Design a protein around this ligand. Sequence first.
Ligand SMILES: *C/C=C1/C(=C/c2[nH]c(/C=C3[NH+]=C(/C=C4\NC(=O)C(C=C)=C4C)C(C)=C\3CCC(=O)O)c(CCC(=O)O)c2C)NC(=O)[C@H]1C
Ligand SMILES: *C/C=C1/C(=C/c2[nH]c(/C=C3[NH+]=C(/C=C4\NC(=O)C(C=C)=C4C)C(C)=C\3CCC(=O)O)c(CCC(=O)O)c2C)NC(=O)[C@H]1C
Lengths: 315, 313
Amino acid sequence: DPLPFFPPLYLGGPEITTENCEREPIHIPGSIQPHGALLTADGHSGEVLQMSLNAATFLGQEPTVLRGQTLAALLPEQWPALQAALPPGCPDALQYRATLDWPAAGHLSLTVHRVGELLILEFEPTEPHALRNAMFALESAPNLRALAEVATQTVRELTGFDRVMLYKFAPDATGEVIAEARREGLHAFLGHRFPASDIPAQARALYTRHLLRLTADTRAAAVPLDPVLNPQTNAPTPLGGAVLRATSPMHMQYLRNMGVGSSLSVSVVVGGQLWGLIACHHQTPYVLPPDLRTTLEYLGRLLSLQVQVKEALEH
Amino acid sequence: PFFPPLYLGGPEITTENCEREPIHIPGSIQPHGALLTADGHSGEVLQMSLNAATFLGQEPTVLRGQTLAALLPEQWPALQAALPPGCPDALQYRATLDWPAAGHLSLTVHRVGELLILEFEPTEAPHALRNAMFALESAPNLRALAEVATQTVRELTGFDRVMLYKFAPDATGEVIAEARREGLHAFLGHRFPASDIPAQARALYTRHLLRLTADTRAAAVPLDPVLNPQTNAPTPLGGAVLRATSPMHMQYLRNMGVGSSLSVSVVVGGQLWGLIACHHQTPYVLPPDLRTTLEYLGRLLSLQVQVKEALEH
Ligand SMILES: *C/C=C1/C(=C/c2[nH]c(/C=C3[NH+]=C(/C=C4\NC(=O)C(C=C)=C4C)C(C)=C\3CCC(=O)O)c(CCC(=O)O)c2C)NC(=O)[C@H]1C
Ligand SMILES: *C/C=C1/C(=C/c2[nH]c(/C=C3[NH+]=C(/C=C4\NC(=O)C(C=C)=C4C)C(C)=C\3CCC(=O)O)c(CCC(=O)O)c2C)NC(=O)[C@H]1C
C-alpha cells in the first residue's frame, strides 16, 4: 500500500523497520557522506546558509568565516557562470559542474544545482578513447543480451568494481540480474530474481529523475548539515539531487550484510520509466572520482537509447 | 543503381542524375589527413594516399610493402580484437599514437569485409559536455531543445553557423533552429527540397553519422592504387571521415560562401530525423577529440528528440 512520507528522524519521525519500508523520507536525511562537503546558498543574494560539519576541512576555512561571506566573494569566477547556467525556476535535475583550484585542498570538483530559491554546492576532490570505443561497440551489439554483456564488461573495465550487474525491472517492480561481470571467486547473481520492495517505491521514483547515486563506504557515519533545517523555510533541505546525500541506514545495513563496502548504480530510463540499473559492488570502500563518474553517466544515456533500439528489434 | 565512378570512365554528375553518384567510392581523401588500407589477416598495406609520406614521415615504397605488425606493434593486436572478421563497417576503433615524425596522431580504423581502413590525423594532449548534456535534458520542449543544441555546438566549436535541419516526410528540409555569428544571412525558417540532400546520401547518413568538408577549395588526394588489389574494385570509403567530398556538394558550399562544413546525423526509430549542420566561412579542421564530443551529442540529441516528441504526441 502506498502511503505518504514520515517526517525525518530529526523532526521526531519514527525509526524505520521492515514494516514501514516505503515511508522513510530518503531525500531529506539532513546529512551527507564524508568524502565531500556541501554548502547551501540563497539563490539571489548568494548568502551561505547551511554547510556540512566537515566543510572547514575541505575548504580550509572556519565556519563563521564561510557563513559570513556571499558566493560572489567566495567564488568570484564561478558565481556569474552559476547564475547564467541555473536560472530561477529551472528544474532541480539540471546540474552545472566546474573544476576549482583551491589553495588548501588541491583540485576540487564543484557540482551545483538549484532547488527553488536554494543553490546546493557539492565539493569533492578530483584527479583515453575508451568511451568512444565503447560507444561504437554498444551500438554494434547484435541483440539485447550481447548489449547487456558488453555494457557490464565495459563498466567493470573502466571502474575496477568487483561486480557490475545489469538489473532489470519487471512490470511488478521485481528485478532480475540479466547480465553481470564479476571478479574471480565471487558467486553469480545472474538469473536471480528479487522482490519488489527490495528497491521500494519512493526510491524508484527518485531514481527516474536523478540518475546516479552511490555509497562510497557502507560503514561511514553521515555528516550533518549545520544548521539541519534550511533557515529560509525552517524546513528540511531537499537533497535528492545531491550525490553526496547520506544513504539511508536501512540500505546501508543490507549492503553490509552482503559484504559490500562500496555501491554505485546508474539508472536506465526508457519511455519515461525506470527500465533497469547498472549496479556496481566493491568489497572494500571505494571512491570513484567525479570525472570517471561522468563517463558512467554518459553510458547510462547511451544504454537507454540502445535498449530502446534493441527492444524495437523484437516484437 | 549507381553510375561507375569517374576514374572507371563513368558519366560526370549533373543536376539530372543527382541520385546515382557513388559518393562512397571516390578513390580519394581530403588532404588534412592520410589513409592506408590493409589486409585483415596479414596486416599488409595494400593502398595508401599519395600524401602518406608527409604525415607518416616514411619513404614512399617502405609503406606499401610493410605490415601493420611491423608498422604499429602495440596497436596491431588491439585492432585484431576490436574489429573481428564479420563485424559491421560502422564499428570503429580509435587510438592516439606518439609517432616520431608527428608529435601525436589520431588513428581511426574500421573494417569492410577483408580490408582494414586506417585514418591518420594530427591530434593533441572539460565539463562543457556534461553541462550540455544536463541542459539538453532540462529543455522543456522540442523548440527549446533545438535552440540549446545549436547554441551548445556553436560554443564548443566556434563554427560560424550551426543549424538544426529537420527532414519532412518527403525529405523536404527545414532549418528549425540556428546559432550564428553576427553578420551572416539567417537560414532560420527556410525549407529546401528533398533533392538538396539526395536519397543515397541520406541512406549513408543513416549508418555513418558524422561527415565534414574541411576546406571547400582543397583538391582531393588519390589512393594508390585506386582499386583494391584484393578485389580489383573500388575501396568503400563510406565509413571514412577523410573520404573525398562529392564535388557536386563542395560546389554548393562554395556558391553559398562556406569554406568549412560539418554535420551530425540525428537518427530516431532507425530513420534519419535531421542533422546538426555547421558552417564556417573559412577552412577549418576540427580536431578528432572535439569531433568525438559532437558524436556524443548526436546520440544524446537522438534520445532527447524522441523523449520530447513523445510529450507532444
Ligand atoms: C525496509 C527497507 C528495505 C530497503 C530499503 C532501500 N533499498 C534501497 C535501494 C536498493 N536496494 C537494492 C537491492 C539489491 N541490491 C543488490 O545487489 C540486488 C541484487 C543483486 C538487489 C535486489 C538496490 C540495488 C538498491 C539501489 C541502490 C544501489 O544500487 O546503489 C533504498 C534507497 C537508497 C537511497 O536512496 O538512499 C532503500 C531505502 N531495501 C530492502 O531490501 C528492504 C529491507
Ligand atoms: C545534384 C545534387 C545536389 C546535391 C548533392 C549532395 N548533397 C549532399 C549532402 C548535403 N546537401 C545539403 C544541402 C544543404 N546545405 C545547406 O546548408 C542547406 C540549407 C541551409 C541545404 C539544403 C546538406 C546539408 C548535405 C549534408 C552534408 C553536410 O552537411 O556536410 C551530398 C552528399 C555528400 C557526401 O556524402 O560527401 C550530395 C552528393 N546537393 C544539392 O543541393 C543538389 C544540387
